[PDB]
Amino acid sequence: ENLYFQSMEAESWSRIIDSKFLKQQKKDVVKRQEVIYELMQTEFHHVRTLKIMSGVYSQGMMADLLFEQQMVEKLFPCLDELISIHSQFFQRILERKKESLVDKNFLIKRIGDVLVNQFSGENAERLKKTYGKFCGQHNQSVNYFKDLYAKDKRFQAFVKKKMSSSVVRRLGIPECILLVTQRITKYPVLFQRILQCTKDNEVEQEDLAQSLSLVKDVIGAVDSKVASYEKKVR
């Protein structure tokens, strides 16, 4: 789905965190809705970061500097895939908000099934391969970027032009790569905060516990892949 539409759905969600409707629910509900918000908002930022990497930097290198498709895969491996995964994950979350209206005021009573789906079966396998690759090529790409900046004056001009743009916050390529690398390790924390906020709901508590166990398996797999890559690079 479209990024502006995604941002409007996010901005809409956040209006309800500030609302009097929410602030006048029970403390445990306010806290639970506040943590589920955090998961959504940070997933939106992740998707935004990825699409800036792709639409601004990656597309710009090919269009302006005549980089090949392969030189860009060196800097940003599996970027198209990541964008697909996280936009879709982000959609599922919004789709859940849309069916959680009350009596425009909503209250997410159930998000565990969405998380379990995302981190099991072939979705989990896609994340493992995707991040294992991105997180493995991680340090080579940052060095490759820094190598290019110091050497190629045309890339140097390109980067300064981009950082000045209103589109990129002041997101440098190194920062982008670093943010994307971290992301997968954020989920256990966000998921576990939702779980400990969830009271008197058995289905949800079970699914959240499951998703938390599941995302740790993915992280493990990614860490094995990264370790092996680095050993091979030497």
Residue numbers in the entry: 1968 to 2070, 2074 to 2204
Provide the authors' original text about this structure:
To investigate whether for our constructs the AKAP-Lbc PH domain contributes to catalysis of nucleotide exchange on RhoA we cloned an expression construct containing just the DH domain (residues 1976–2211, terminating at the end of αI) for comparison with the combined DH–PH domain. In this inactive conformation, the critical Glu2001 can no longer bind to RhoA. We cannot rule out that the inactive α-helical conformation is induced by the N-terminal protein tag which is at the start of this α-helix. However, we note that the region around Trp1980 is weakly predicted to be α-helical by the PsiPred server, suggesting that a conformational exchange in and out of an α-helix induced by the absence or presence of RhoA is a realistic model.
RhoGEF domains decrease the affinity of a Rho GTPase for GDP so that GTP, present in higher concentrations in the cell, can bind.
